Design a protein around this nucleic acid. Structure first.
Lengths: 94, 136, 78
RNA sequence: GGUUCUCCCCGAAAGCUAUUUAGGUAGCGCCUCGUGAAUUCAUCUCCGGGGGUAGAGCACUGUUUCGGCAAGGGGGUCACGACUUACCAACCCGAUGCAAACUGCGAAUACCGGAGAAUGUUAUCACGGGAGACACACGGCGGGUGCUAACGUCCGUCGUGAAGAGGGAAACAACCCAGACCGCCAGCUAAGGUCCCAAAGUCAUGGUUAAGUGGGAAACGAUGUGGGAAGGCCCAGACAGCCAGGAUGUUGGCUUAGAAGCAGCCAUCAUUUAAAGAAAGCGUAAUAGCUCACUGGUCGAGUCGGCCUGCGCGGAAGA
RNA sequence: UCCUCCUAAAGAGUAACGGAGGAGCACGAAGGUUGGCUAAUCCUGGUCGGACAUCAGGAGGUUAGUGCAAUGGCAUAAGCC
RNA sequence: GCUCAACGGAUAAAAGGUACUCCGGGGAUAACAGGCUGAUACCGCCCAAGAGUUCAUAUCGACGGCGGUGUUUGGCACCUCGAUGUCGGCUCAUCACAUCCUGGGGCUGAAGUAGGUCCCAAGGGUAUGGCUGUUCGCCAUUUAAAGUGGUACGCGAGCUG
RNA sequence: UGCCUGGCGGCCGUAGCGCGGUGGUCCCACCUGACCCCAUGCCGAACUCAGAAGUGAAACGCCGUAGCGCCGAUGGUAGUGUGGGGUCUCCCCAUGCGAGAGUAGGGAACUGCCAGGCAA
């Protein structure tokens, strides 16, 4: 019952991901199965308010991208080391 | 005064304090005291911020100190010219990058652990913040 | 006061002199090194100072052989 | 110390090595002049390379904290032997940091070499004539040292000064822009600027600031103020006022002097009930004592406490 | 004066009254070659015999050794005979 | 055949004094003063353990933290070695304020009188003697008080020595 | 050609261990005997020789298994070349390169020359 509206990243790198992170957004990625890993771009203040709930980190999520529905869990997440925010989340496509 | 036991070499270089930290996540405890500023803590400052922090949580509970000094600081005496060797070691500092969880705590409620790290952080030369053990 | 250090030595000028594909006339020192950091391979001799000297006016080429992966120095023949 | 006319072209060095040498000199590096030579050399792209620094990691060398298992160790207890055993704790395992003299990993650049195109007054090398110079300065980056002090000191590398005027930084070798053949009462720009001194926007739009901030400074403090993300409690009635209750047996224990709602220990009760915590602080010698909490009445619409960020305030005293 | 490491910024080089240590030799075998061999330290069992001698087996893997400081090297051993 | 180890070795062969000193140079290099710095010294804050019959914050503030000042002791060697005369006393001062007195306040573990601590304020005021070369210090006796510092540790083309 | 096996390599842990199974007519290993060739700082244990009764136990080869070692992306983070900037013991922006660790995952090597056996 956790729905996260996301987008597809079109530029990626150091400079692309710091420009993206100063716009109250951050990058993510969905990977797993046998298919291509899809680079996922999604808004920060939503997912930062999602992850306080402890069933974010255990139960199956649905990332909405391109109109599709993709059922993921959350595998690995990078905090910002002295600010209460995020940089990147690893979602296993499952 | 936390001090290393039988070090390799007595005197080491100055070195720069660049980069981010490693003790970012709260591992051993439930509540931590994370650094935001880039400074360095002496062994008298770790131990003074521990006495001001053990006291508020009257001793039951458990406290983990995630920093140890292991870096000697030399000091030239007064009325001594430059040169004629490196100074002699007086005290021992730990280098703190931003993000370093300094202390941790477990076994006390969330507000007493809140109101003990602030009494500890008034003894530190770096600007710290309060963090809680996060899932994953 | 006083000091007890301040002593070192003439830097020995070690390392590799001739690199990769770079034609060396026979007898040309390639690597001047302490021990056998780089081992002698095809057409390349090893001296009494572990200086791998060339032995055939050709190229160079470093490699990794056996089951120890020791950079090895051979000589392509051109 | 001083070294006397003019013009033109190029134009350094304050480095290494050695020196009874350190303010001197000699060879080399850099300079100049002459001669002779190879797409010689430089940039770039492409290719072959070697690393072991930045980072990272903790298998090794050392350091380091935590828990588990735990030899041993330690305390105290026994009759040649051991019993009870508040404690110290190696090897391993799981988690955690650190290192110039740590590395099972590892960049960027830099360097050597090869191919190729463009470009550059051969810029390259070798030899011969002549030198000077071997006191460097600051700035950026990488460090040592010192106080992560100094317009300090000592190397690395780049720039400027030296030996470089001009515009800018109020003035300000060494900073920013830019390299003065000569002349002109011509135009375009750079850094920096456009209210007056003082050339050019009292330009247009959109926010912020109340501090003369701008136009010095920190830990720390605070209903200053603007934007954001979430919550709690709310027109089945909150928040601050305004009227009632704000207690019953608990002198409850405690070493048996007293702690007694509000002492050390504590558990942190349960009835009476719209409401009372065996109490948050004010009373105390211990009680007595005012008191809000927790409940309605009233009241009439939002209120409170955190967080992330913009700019301000205090902290702020010199002849 | 000489050698080793770091500073030394992954080619070489690089300073300070910078941080650490060493040399002013030894050897006629400790050199040459051919032929073989494999350490350290714990563990159990065992006469005197113990924490530790020699013997045996196992674990272990080069944590050993290298005429002598440090670094690099060393199983094809440069280590041992 | 040389610890010619001052190891590119000046000779086979070599130590000291100079306040009796002299010459050539140097601010390339010390003493004084200035600059830069602020380790130190000094002043102010921050946290609040404890003391104060109870009560941290009347007063004091440990363990530690953050600053200011340019007054200490120092660091550096930038100006000066073809000369910037020095310690203390005298004479005359001058500014700052971190105020000793006088003046106005807050708090007090302040009844009064007298304090303590703190904020505001620089108008004027701010001892004489004994000893010592002394500044300091100690002492005697006063005073409303006997302030702390900058000024080449003010002041020798003004004096002293 | 297809399996088994032995020598010599290519490569060098995706190839190494652990654990479970498996093979003897061939080959291989132990094994048998040693007076001799040779051999032990004692010992045929090893080395060496002469043979072939026994077993596949050990070891070796093969098979199966991920319990460890090892391989390992994409994304992000760190670092940094060049050019600007700042509240400048540290960082930021434009651009170029871009790890290490960790994650998904892969994975119980593959392969050449010759010879022997056995089936075709």
């Amino acid at each position: 019952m956790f729905t996260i509206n996301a987008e597809v990243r079109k530029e990626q790198g150091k400079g692309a991901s710091r420009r993206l992170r100063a716009a109250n957004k951050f990058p993510a990625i969905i990977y797993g199965g046998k298919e291509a890993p899809l680079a996922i771009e999604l808004d920060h203040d939503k997912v930062m308010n999602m992850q306080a709930k402890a069933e974010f980190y255990s139960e199956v999520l649905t990332i909405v991208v391109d109109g599709k529905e993709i059922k993921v869990k959350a595998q690995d997440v990078q905090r910002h080391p002295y600010k209460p925010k995020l940089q990147h989340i690893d979602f296993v496509r499952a | 005064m936390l001090q290393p036991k039988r070090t390799k070499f007595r005197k080491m270089h100055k070195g720069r304090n660049r980069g981010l930290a490693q003790g970012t996540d709260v591992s051993f405890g439930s509540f931590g005291l994370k650094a935001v500023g880039r400074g360095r803590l002496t062994a008298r400052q770790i131990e003074a911020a521990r006495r001001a922090m053990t006291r508020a949580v009257k001793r039951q509970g458990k406290i983990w100190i995630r920093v140890f000094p292991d870096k000697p600081i030399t000091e030239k005496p007064l009325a001594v010219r430059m040169g004629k060797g490196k100074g002699n070691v007086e005290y021992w500092v730990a280098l703190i990058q931003p993000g370093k969880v300094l202390y941790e705590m477990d076994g006390v409620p969330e507000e007493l652990a809140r109101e003990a790290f602030k009494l500890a952080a008034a003894k530190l030369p770096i600007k710290t913040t309060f963090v809680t053990k996060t899932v994953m | 006061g006083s000091t007890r250090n301040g002593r070192d030595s003439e830097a020995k000028r070690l390392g590799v002199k001739r690199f990769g594909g770079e034609s060396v006339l026979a007898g040309s020192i390639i690597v001047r090194q302490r021990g056998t950091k780089f081992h002698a391979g095809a057409n390349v001799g090893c001296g009494r100072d572990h200086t791998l000297f060339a032995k055939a006016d050709g190229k160079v080429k470093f490699e990794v052989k056996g089951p120890k992966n020791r950079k090895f120095i051979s000589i392509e023949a051109e």
